[PDB]
Amino acid sequence: FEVITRIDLGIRPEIQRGEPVSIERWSQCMDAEGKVLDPENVKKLIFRGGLCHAVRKLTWKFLLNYFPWDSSKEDRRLLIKRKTDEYFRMKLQWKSVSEEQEKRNTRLKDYKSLIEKDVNRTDRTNPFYEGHENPGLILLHDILMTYCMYDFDLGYIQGMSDLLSPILYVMENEVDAFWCFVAFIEQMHCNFEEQMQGMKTELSQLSTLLKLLDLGFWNYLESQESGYLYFCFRWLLIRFKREFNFQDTLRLWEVMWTGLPCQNFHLLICCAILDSEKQKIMENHYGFNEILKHINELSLKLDVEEVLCKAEAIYCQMMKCKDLPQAVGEILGLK
Numbered sequence: 001f002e003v004i005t006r007i008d009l010g011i012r013p014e015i016q017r018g019e020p021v022s023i024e025r026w027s028q029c030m031d032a033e034g035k036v037l038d039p040e041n042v043k044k045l046i047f048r049g050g051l052c053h054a055v056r057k058l059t060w061k062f063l064l065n066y067f068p069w070d071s072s073k074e075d076r077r078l079l080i081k082r083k084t085d086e087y088f089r090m091k092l093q094w095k096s097v098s099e100e101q102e103k104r105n106t107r108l109k110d111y112k113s114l115i116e117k118d119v120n121r122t123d124r125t126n127p128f129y130e131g132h133e134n135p136g137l138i139l140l141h142d143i144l145m146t147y148c149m150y151d152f153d154l155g156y157i158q159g160m161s162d163l164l165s166p167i168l169y170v171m172e173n174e175v176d177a178f179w180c181f182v183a184f185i186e187q188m189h190c191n192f193e194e195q196m197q198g199m200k201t202e203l204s205q206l207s208t209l210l211k212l213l214d215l216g217f218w219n220y221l222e223s224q225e226s227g228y229l230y231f232c233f234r235w236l237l238i239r240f241k242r243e244f245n246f247q248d249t250l251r252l253w254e255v256m257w258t259g260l261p262c263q264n265f266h267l268l269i270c271c272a273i274l275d276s277e278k279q280k281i282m283e284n285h286y287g288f289n290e291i292l293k294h295i296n297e298l299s300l301k302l303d304v305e306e307v308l309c310k311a312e313a314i315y316c317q318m319m320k321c322k323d324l325p326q327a328v329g330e331i332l333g334l335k
Contacts, residue, residue, distance in 0.1 A: 003325050004212045013316045015309040018048035020251075026055045034073030036062065042069075043258040050251045056170050063257040064167070064180040080175075087175045090149040091142065108148065111155040115144045118161040126246055128169050139168055143178045150182065157192040160185070162238045166249055191237060202236050203229055205331050206267050212328050213271060213314070217278045226288045231295045232270055239266065243273075248304045255308060261315050263333030272310035273302065 029042050036042055042062075051059050061067040066083075067076060094108065102109050119140045123129050128136045143164060148155045164181045171177040190198030206229060211218045221227050234242055239256075241249050256265055277298070281291055318324065319334060329335040 001208070001211055001325060001327065004215060007212070007321065007323060007325070009213075009317050009321050011317070012313045013320075015312045015316070016048075017305050017309055018050075020050040020052045021045055021055060021059070022052055023055055026059065031072075034076065035071070036069050039069035043260060047255055047258045047260040050254050053247075053250070056250065056254075057172070060167070060170050060180065060254070060257075061176065063254065065183040066176065066179045083179050084175050087146065087178055091146040093149040094145045107152075107155065111148045112145065114156050114158060115141055115161070118156075118158055119144070122161055123165055123246070126165075126169070129165070136168060139174050139177070140164060143168065143174060143181060146178060147181065147185075151185075154185075154189070154192055159238050160192065162241050166241070166246065166253065169246070170250065188239075199233065199237060202264075202267065203232065205264065206232060206236075206270055208327055208331065209267055209271055210274070212318075212325065213275075214278055217274075217282060220282050224287045224291075226291060231288070231292045235270055235273075236266065240269065243299050243302060244304060245300060248302075251304055252308070261312060262319075264331060265311065265315075267331065268311040268314050269307060271314055272307045273298065275310060275314075 025045070029037050029045075031037055039062075046059070046063070058067075062069060067079075071079070094112075097105070097108065102112070119137055122137070122140065128134075129140070140161060144156055144161060147160075163184060164177065167180050167184060168177040171180060185192070188198070190196075190201065207218070207227065210221075210229075218227075221229070240252055244252060252269075256269075259265075262268070277294065281294060284290070286294065315332065318328065318332065324334070326335055
């Protein structure tokens with residue numbers, strides 16, 4: 001990819017972020033039948049400004065494909081009844097397993113133990129999941145176990161509880177959170193498969209983008225044998241959840257789930273975060289262990305909307321570049 005030396009990315013444009021969607025604004029977007037008037041427009045609005053927390057319960061169901069965009073209120077009433085029966089049907093499958101039975105099913109037994117390890121260790125500082133006997137933690141367990149019946153090949157992989165946690169918090173319904181969680185995992189599903197590709201593929205795509213953006217930073221990582229980027233693993237896997245506040249995570253996910261501006265936006269978000277730290281890493285001659293240390297110290301110290309601006313800015317800077325390597329163009333979906 002030495003075509004990147006003869007390329008030029010001139011100027012990073014300034015991005016104007018915008019304002020979150022109010023209850024008022026959403027009401028204009030929904031029809032009297034309950035239909036979303038212009039779903040592509042809605043996505044445009046959610047992308048720049050995000051969503052206010054009140055409307056977040058209903059709108060997330062659309063973003064996460066639980067509620068189809070072309071659907072009406074009557075469509076939904078029938079849909080919810082179907083999804084609910086289907087949910088408790090599956091829940092019964094793990095919940096009716098006996099003590100004798102569980103010993104003789106090792107993969108279920110093992111999934112079950114991973115869930116308990118991860119659920120009792122989850123955001124215990126957050127008011128939803130903190131309590132003597134917390135209802136939310138029980139739902140966390142139940143929703144995850146039911147997912148193992150839904151997809152048994154996948155079952156549970158550590159970190160999936162961190163992915164469900166915000167969704168349950170917004171939804172507050174066991175069934176609703178489940179089906180939203182399902183859709184959230186399906187887009188990423190490759191990441192969690194036994195041989196993790198899409199953790200590898202996404203990390204490869206990330207390296208390809210960084211090669212074009214800062215070539216020297218890419219080379220320095222190769223010098224330290226950090227070229228495959230494992231300091232970004234937790235970023236991509238948990239979708240930055242560990243790197244932001246709960247309320248922060250909610251906005252970051254909202255904006256991403258619109259699927260704008262390009263096909264993989266989360267990769268540019270990695271670039272946006274890394275862009276500011278490029279010098280500090282190279283100057284100090286860190287190396288892998290020290291780099292992981294520097295990035296771990298970025299946690300909770302990051303500004304969401306600065307990140308979302310840089311990420312969008314890098315996209316504009318790229319799409320406006322007329323000569324672009326096809327390798328990069330395919331990742332963003334410009335080809």
